């Protein structure tokens, strides 16, 4: 399966002077990093989170981010001043950036920004641009961001070069866990509509009628349940899964 690497950043500006920025990093459905406002450094959530980068390499990458975060906070604040009174707090910015690895040596990177719940800006090619639906006033921030050539180079490198290099390294060290196979336990119940409670399974794809959403357990495993709406005397729940190995539930 072709995995997706996501760095998710969420910053909140409550007013002119108060602010915070917290991030989390996923590879497929498994958390690889955490970096909270309180913390001064990015933190590993797995043994292999550093991938096959060296310490030198990683210290150089983390410092770029340490600088980025402080810079980001101030710029957002100044861009608010530029556009105001058209802007107003509270403000919520979100960023998902990373790369999805395909068969062979093939990546497609991304950097998507959302403003107040809605996706409005992405990095594409060599510059920042707004996406369809975005409000017209962002053109000014975009002009200003695109003025900063140094940033553009650094983003171009991160997206084009560093991401897929790093993730190809991550996928090697994380083979163990990513390919790990855990068995589902399923228990039968009914409320006034039958319910089949499959839980504990990994990876995600599972053949469990009326399906629900994939709910996560705290040990990085998955919970799911399919309903079935008097006529119970001829029914029993069945589930297929990777971890079972030719033995259904």
């Amino acid at each position: 399966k072709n995995y997706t690497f996501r760095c998710l950043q969420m910053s909140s500006f409550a007013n002119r002077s108060w602010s915070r920025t917290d991030s989390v990093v996923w590879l497929g459905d498994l958390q690889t990093h955490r970096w909270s406002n309180d913390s001064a450094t990015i933190s590993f959530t797995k043994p292999w989170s550093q991938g096959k980068l060296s310490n030198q390499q990683w210290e150089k990458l983390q410092h770029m981010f340490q600088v980025y975060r402080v810079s980001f906070t101030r710029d957002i604040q100044e861009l608010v001043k530029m556009m105001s009174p058209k802007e107003d707090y509270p403000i919520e910015i979100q960023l998902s950036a990373g790369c999805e690895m395909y068969p062979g040596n093939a990546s497609e990177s991304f950097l998507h920004v959302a403003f107040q719940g809605k996706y409005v800006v992405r990095f594409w090619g060599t510059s920042w641009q707004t996406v369809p639906g975005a409000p017209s006033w962002l053109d000014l921030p975009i002009k200003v961001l695109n003025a900063d050539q140094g940033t553009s180079a650094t983003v171009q490198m991160l997206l084009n070069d560093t991401c897929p290099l790093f993730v190809r390294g991550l996928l090697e060290a994380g083979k163990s866990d990513l390919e790990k196979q855990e068995k589902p336990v399923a228990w039968l119940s009914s409320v006034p509509q039958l319910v089949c409670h499959v839980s504990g399974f990994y990876p995600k794809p599972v053949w469990v009628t009326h399906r629900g959403d994939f709910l996560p357990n705290a040990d990085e495993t998955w919970y799911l349940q399919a309903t079935l709406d008097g006529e119970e005397a001829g029914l029993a729940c069945r589930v297929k899964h990777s971890s079972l190995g030719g033995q259904d539930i």
Partner: T-cell receptor
Amino acid sequence: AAVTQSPRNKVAVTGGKVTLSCNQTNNHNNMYWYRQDTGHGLRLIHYSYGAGSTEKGDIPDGYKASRPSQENFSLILELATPSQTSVYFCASGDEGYTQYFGPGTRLLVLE
Amino acid sequence: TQVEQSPQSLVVRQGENCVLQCNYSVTPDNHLRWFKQDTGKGLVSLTVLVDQKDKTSNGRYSATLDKDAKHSTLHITATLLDDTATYICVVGDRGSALGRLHFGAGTQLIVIP
């Protein structure tokens, strides 16, 4: 890319009102007011991102700023003091990093 | 005072060369700019350095920038009387209008004719 300042030289009295004015015909959105003092680099007092905007700088206290239009940007001293005796520089800029500086204004505040 | 210049003043005989220092802690450090300011007058830009390791030259003025060392030097070759001025170092922390400039308090050069 010119930026003018009037007056180029000013003498004021403590408690009096002084208005320093800066014009620019570069159609720059952004303008800035600094003061130069011996033993210090230029220090940012106020700045504007366009008409109607003024923003407090690093040393805003004792000064109000007015941006009536794209072209003009004023520094206002309502109750002047001897400590506001300085040389005041205005500058302007577009989205880029360069700021283009005015020729300066020498303010002297006496008792 | 994230930008520091050295020396504070210097006196040279016309024809001699001089080097001026600028050291800084500003972060991040997008570009460094050298202004010349004549006694009484205002701020004329001489050069601006942008790269991690940069080297510029405008006439008899030439300059170096080292971002690892966060250090710059302005060289004046064959000084003239009109070089008698105050040379100011300015570091900008963005590559756009979102940046703030950070000024050193300058270095006085007197050239003896």
